[PDB]
Design a protein around this nucleic acid. Structure first.
Length: 1198
DNA sequence: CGTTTTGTCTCGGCTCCCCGACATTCTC
RNA sequence: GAGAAUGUCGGGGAGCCGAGGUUGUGAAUUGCUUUCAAAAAUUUUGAAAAGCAAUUCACAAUAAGGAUUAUUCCGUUGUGAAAACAUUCAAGGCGGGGCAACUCGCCUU
DNA sequence: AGACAAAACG
């Protein structure tokens, strides 16, 4: 009779919901509720997630965290270097005097920026190494270049000198810190590739392109030849860009089995390709037969103008730096007795590892070279263990009681698929599944070649000795042939065949000098564990040697065979090793099967089932299936399902169906939901918000009572992911426990389709209602454009229908320009019965009669469907006209964070490493505090700076976007003179003057554009801006960094009112809000400077009501008589700046037309949003607006 | 004051866990 | 419909590293402007200082900040009034692995 | 590419 129907329409970031109480038989019913919950998401994300580009806040957070981690590790390395050098007494006194060695070990003292080589005496800075600079000057003079060079170039002179001569210890400390700065490229695993690994960057010139008589696509493909005598692997067609062209590749050469090089090719571009640049730089360094430091020094001697950082040597292999540092340290150890002292080395070890005795003892066997290179500077941590994230077994659990007097479950991790147990398990399954057929007649020729246990044992033995089986091999084993039979499985596919044991056996046969019985099952497992667990080069080699020593095997060929074992691919089965060990005895047969190897419980169940007795743990389906298992010996070679049941007592997964008896169950499910459990954050957010909305609807309209929702209909309209998951979750609310409703989804869940929705909307008149609803916007557009092209008259209906001109019809949609249509969709989905979906999905009737009943019951006479009730259209219009869209807000600023860090704790007279919690109140800022770009503060006497504003400058590349207006924004006036002269010389065309060729020409002949006076080359210039930027911080040089508020951080907009009644508006910066919230105060000050009391604060997505011009809303309240007129005056905050707040009418989702600078028209002017009302009154919203509060269901919380 | 225009951090490598969609064989 | 095995194509998360850029300190060279402060004929040449830079080098900071002395970290994710949490999380035993720290397994509550 | 935040423009 009376049925409560909940229709849901789920979008990318929208949730339309409708609740109706329908009685279809009597054509009665009513709409209980409608609404649309919006999850604000910029169109950038909506357009990006379709293709996908780091579309995740979590990803950005992780990127920032990784950058911070690298920075922190560099700082820690510097601090440890400082401590070690201080103990060694290598730091200069003035430099060490400003470093803390008592409390903040190795850190610079607060408000100091010491430099190792610049000594400050009474405000004058002096270079520290004068003699080295003089020697460098002698070098340059001998090179005949100049004698005026920067002092800090001495670092490279020292680096070259340190290789073969004594240098001062302070210079050595400088070199060590510089080495710490730049570490180079290094891969943790390593695995030196093909011995040749040519990977040589070469530049080759094409000699001729011999059309190789290869006509393809109506054109003869040409080959290529190079002066060296090489032929390009691929053919060429466009000869214009290949004829005598000096192209560059990365060629890889491999000595093929025949005994020749298999040279490949890979076209690259220098100064654009990472690999090409790296290889070219490395080859240049190598060909000089000199260290990287010496290479840099000599290049700098040749060309003093050369850029080093970012131009000459960018990323290179860490081996170069390591070799140079090793050479320097080895040479300098001969001269400085401090590097030979054991007492000082022990002191340094104690300083660094005062609490790690094991590491101290390990280091006591090394020297300073190892300490500086391997321990401090070039130490790279290994990857964190991921084995904690491995899936759990679905069968085997363990139960234990914690200190809280409870009993909870520990899970068993799944088995790696490289484990021999898994290999045998899979092999037995595959053997049982196999069956043969004959080509001619396609008959089950099996049961004739695999009938007795002997045949199965023969097949199992044949398979074990392999790593892969195919059509031909399997057919041959039986002596059969391809010309007469087939193996059911794909006729050209291969299957894994116990590869682990194969590989181990092959690499153990290659060792020779061992009897052909060494490899047994236990040895196989031990070797597999050695290979799988020790994933580190040195560790792996030591483990291999130790294994070859414990077992009397020659560790010369063995190590060589097993030193290049390919690591096992990362993959895990469904079950754990315990479950597989339990199941295998059942699955084995023949000589591999023995009764004593079945666990006690399984043997008991076998005894019970053979006895035919009664056990509550044994189901009747069992005795149906295990009828043939009369005797104990029948329990051989059982397929996975049977053995799984026998061991565990459940016929695979039976599910639970479940039933939620009140809203509390849904609340618990929401509470226990785990983040990152679904495909992507978007669908997870939509789903979770849908569940919250459903819970709110349940509580509001049914008090959370059991079985309130008679039916739930769903629609989506990529997004498909939320089609079945949501249905499965929601089936727990509308399930039936009488047994009639069983399955993945309850029969009360009725997914729809677009066909029914659109057809019903057309037939029920909802399209007319929607068009009448949206018409006034198009009338307003007509008025704005002073035309009549946004509304088209039709005489069949005798009225105006909204329309858009063709030029603005790119992606226009009459439905997408308003949020409320989501609710409308839900309504159509809540009134479409299972009869409607069946009728319009299976309209193919095979006979008019059998579906004529549905046509009569549902369609007026097949023309149109009957309305759900008489006043359905009127009710739908009235309900749509009074919907307040609810928007989700994200106002997180500060949130408590917990920090657990490793530390040595003294317990029971012993130091033990454990995780300690950081004390105090450490907040976490949940918004970006500023933009990345940083500008410096300047004062230009030729620029007027109004009070309250500052000039800030930043470096920009000189390009074609520099005309006179922008040339006038350069802080330097000499550069402005030069650029103006050059631009005038080029007919005032920046496209010609400031192109790369133009810039190079200007730099060549700068004299001519500077009145004959020399100037340095110009590549970048500091452009300034007059505004209000704030300092990043207050400590150190952070006071000199000026930045701007980040996007979407103007979250608070205060509105105050004086005693007179006048209103004042302000925008609270993020930092002030952070401080106020940390202090425990309100986000907005309760009084401004003038002392005006705060009326209220606005945030993005908040809702305000703008009273009519005549209305005097001072203490109105009465927020229940919300007719359409009142709802038409509800606006939503969009953005804020200064004293300006922008609004959009709450129902508007997309503009009919956006704003373009060319035509200069838009629905809401240039900002796509207005400070005033859309109506003709055009009144400032903030002058009379009053805030309102709405819940998820769109009810005003007056 | 009311409106528009402008500018916005960028690129490289490799490892190891999970989920899902679609094919194949087989069992219940 | 559920499950096991074998592949292809996508997505999510976490982790170990690399190279620039920007701002700021110091420096080498060359410029523009102003002021001093001379010499010369309102104009021209010279020293100093300040402001603003350009090319190159070393160095500091790189989300404000808060711990810690472990070769550790927390700060841009989610929930939500508890400014409270999620994203580490028990005990044993029997082994593999290493120069040892530490890492990988199996077994019972 | 998008949309905010603010300088820039009358």
């Amino acid at each position: 009779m009376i049925k409560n129907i909940l229709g849901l329409a789920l979008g990318t970031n929208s949730i339309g919901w409708a609740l109706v109480k329908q009685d279809f038989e009597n054509k009665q019913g009513e709409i209980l509720g409608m609404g649309s919950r919006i999850i604000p998401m910029s169109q950038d994300i909506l357009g990006d997630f379709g293709k996908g580009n780091s579309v995740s806040q979590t990803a950005e957070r992780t990127k920032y965290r990784s950058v911070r981690r690298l920075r922190e590790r560099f700082l820690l390395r510097r601090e440890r270097l400082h401590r070690v050098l201080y103990i060694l007494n290598f730091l200069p006194e003035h430099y060490a005097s400003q470093i803390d060695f008592e409390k903040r070990l190795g850190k610079f003292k607060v408000e100091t920026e010491p430099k190792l080589v610049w000594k400050n005496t009474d405000g004058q800075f002096s270079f520290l190494f004068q003699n080295s600079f003089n020697e460098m000057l002698e070098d340059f003079k001998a090179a005949g270049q100049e004698l005026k060079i920067p002092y800090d170039w001495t670092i490279y002179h020292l680096r070259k000198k340190a290789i073969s001569q004594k240098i001062e210890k302070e210079e050595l400390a400088w070199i060590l810190l510089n080495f710490n700065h730049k570490r180079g490229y290094y891969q943790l695993r390593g695995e030196d590739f093909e011995e040749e690994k040519d990977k040589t960057f070469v530049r080759l010139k094409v000699d001729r392109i011999v059309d190789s008589g290869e006509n393809v696509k109506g054109k003869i493909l040409y080959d290529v030849y190079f002066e060296n005598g090489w032929k390009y692997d691929k053919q060429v067609v466009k000869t214009e860009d290949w004829v005598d062209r000096t192209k560059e590749f990365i060629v890889s050469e491999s000595i093929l089995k025949n005994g020749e090089t298999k040279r490949t090719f890979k076209a690259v571009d220098s100064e654009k390709d990472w690999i090409a640049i790296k290889t070219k730089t490395e080859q240049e360094i190598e060909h000089s037969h000199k260290t990287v430091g010496t290479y840099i020094y000599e290049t700098l001697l040749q060309n003093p103008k050369q850029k080093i950082k970012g131009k000459l040597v960018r990323t290179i292999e860490r081996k170069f730096y390591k070799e140079e540092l090793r050479q320097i340290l080895e040479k300098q150890k001969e001269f400085h007795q401090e590097l030979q002292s054991d007492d000082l080395y022990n002191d340094c070890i104690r300083e660094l590892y005062r609490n790690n005795e094991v590491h101290q003892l390990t280091l006591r066997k090394k020297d300073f070279v190892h300490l500086f290179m391997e321990d401090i500077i070039f130490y790279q941590r290994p990857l964190r263990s991921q084995k904690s994230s491995v899936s759990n077994c679905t069968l085997e659990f363990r139960k234990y009681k914690g200190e809280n007097g409870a009993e909870h479950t520990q899970y068993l991790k799944a088995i790696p698929k490289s484990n021999p147990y898994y290999q045998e398990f899979r092999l037995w399954q595959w053997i049982f599944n196999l069956n043969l057929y004959t080509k001619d007649n396609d008959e089950n020729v099996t049961k004739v070649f695999l009938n007795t246990t002997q045949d199965f044992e023969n097949l199992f033995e044949f398979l074990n000795t392999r790593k892969e089986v195919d059509q031909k091999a399997l057919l041959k084993h039986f002596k059969l042939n391809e010309k007469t039979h087939r193996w059911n499985f794909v006729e050209d596919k291969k299957y894994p065949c116990n590869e682990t044991k194969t590989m181990i056996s092959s690499r153990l046969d290659k060792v020779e000098n061992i009897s052909d019985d060494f490899l047994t099952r236990d040895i196989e497992q031990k070797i597999w564990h050695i290979i799988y667990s020790v994933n580190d080069k040195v560790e792996y080699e030591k483990a291999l040697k130790s294994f070859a020593r414990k077992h009397h095997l020659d560790e010369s060929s063995f190590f060589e065979a097993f030193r290049k074992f390919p690591p096992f691919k990362s993959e895990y089965g469904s079950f754990s090793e315990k479950a597989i060990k339990k199941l295998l005895p059942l699955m084995r047969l023949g000589k591999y099967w023995n009764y004593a190897e079945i666990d006690k419980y399984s043997r008991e169940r076998i005894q019970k089932i053979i006895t035919g007795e009664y056990d509550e743990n044994i189901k009747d389906k069992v005795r149906e299936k295990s009828v043939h298992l009369t005797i104990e010996n029948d329990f051989q070679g059982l397929q996975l399902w049977l053995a799984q049941y026998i061991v565990y007592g459940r016929h695979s997964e039976a599910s639970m169906i479940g039933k939620w008896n009140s809203a509390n169950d849904l609340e618990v499910f929401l509470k226990d939901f785990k983040q990152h459990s679904l495909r992507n954050p978007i669908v997870e957010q939509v789903i979770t918000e849908t569940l919250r909305v459903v819970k709110d609807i349940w509580l509001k309209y049914g008090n959370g009572t059991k079985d309130f929702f008679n039916e739930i209909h769903i629609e989506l309209g990529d997004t498909r992911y939320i089609s079945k998951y949501i249905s499965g979750i929601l089936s727990n609310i509308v399930r039936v426990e009488d047994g009639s409703d069983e399955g993945v989804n309850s029969k009360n869940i009725v997914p729809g389709n677009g066909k029914i929705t659109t057809q019903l909307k057309q037939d029920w008149g909802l399209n007319d209602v929607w068009n009448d609803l949206i018409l006034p916007r198009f009338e307003r557009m007509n008025q704005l454009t002073n035309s009549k092209d946004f509304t088209a008259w039709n005489e069949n209906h005798q009225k105006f229908l909204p329309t858009v001109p063709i030029e603005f019809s790119k992606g226009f949609s009459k439905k997408r320009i308003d949020h409320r249509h989501h609710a409308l969709d839900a309504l159509v989905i809540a009134c479409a019965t299972t009869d409607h979906v069946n009728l319009l999905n299976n309209q193919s009737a095979k006979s008019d009669t059998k579906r004529y009943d549905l046509k009569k019951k549902l369609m007026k006479f097949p023309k149109q469907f009957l309305k759900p009730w008489e006043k359905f259209t009127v009710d739908a219009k009235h309900n749509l006209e009074s919907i307040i869209v609810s928007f989700k807000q994200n106002l997180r600023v500060i949130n408590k964070a917990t920090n657990y860090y490793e530390k040595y704790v003294e317990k029971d007279g012993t130091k033990n490493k454990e995780r300690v919690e950081q004390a105090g109140t450490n907040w976490a800022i949940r918004k970006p505090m500023h933009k990345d770009t940083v500008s410096g503060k300047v004062d230009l006497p030729w620029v007027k700076v109004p009070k309250g504003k500052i000039l800030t400058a930043t470096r920009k590349s000189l390009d074609s976007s520099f005309d006179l207006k922008s040339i006038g924004s350069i802080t330097d006036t000499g550069i402005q003179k030069i650029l103006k002269n050059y631009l005038a010389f080029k007919d005032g065309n920046p496209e010609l003057a400031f192109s790369p060729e133009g810039i190079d020409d200007l730099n060549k002949n700068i004299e001519k554009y500077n009145d004959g006076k020399p100037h340095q080359p110009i590549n970048k210039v500091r452009v300034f801006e007059l505004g209000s930027k704030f300092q990043v911080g207050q400590t150190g040089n952070k006071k000199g960094k000026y930045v701007e508020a980040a996007k979407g951080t103007n979250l608070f907009f205060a509105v105050y009112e004086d005693e007179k009644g006048k209103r004042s508006y302000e925008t609270i910066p993020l930092n002030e809000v952070i401080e106020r919230q940390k202090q425990g105060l309100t986000s907005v000050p309760l009084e401004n400077e003038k002392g005006s009391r705060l009326l209220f604060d606005l945030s993005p997505n908040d809702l305000v009501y703008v009273p009519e011009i005549d209305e005097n809303i001072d203490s109105n309240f009465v927020f229940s008589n919300l007719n359409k007129e009142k709802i038409s005056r509800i606006y939503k905050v969009e953005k804020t700046s200064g004293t300006e707040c922008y609004f959009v009418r709450q129902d508007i989702a997309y503009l009919i037309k956006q704003y373009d600078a060319k035509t200069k028209i838009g629905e809401l002017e240039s900002q796509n949003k207005l400070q005033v009302t859309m109506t003709d009154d055009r009144i400032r919203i903030t002058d009379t607006c009053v805030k309102i509060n709405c819940d998820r269901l769109g009810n005003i919380n007056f």
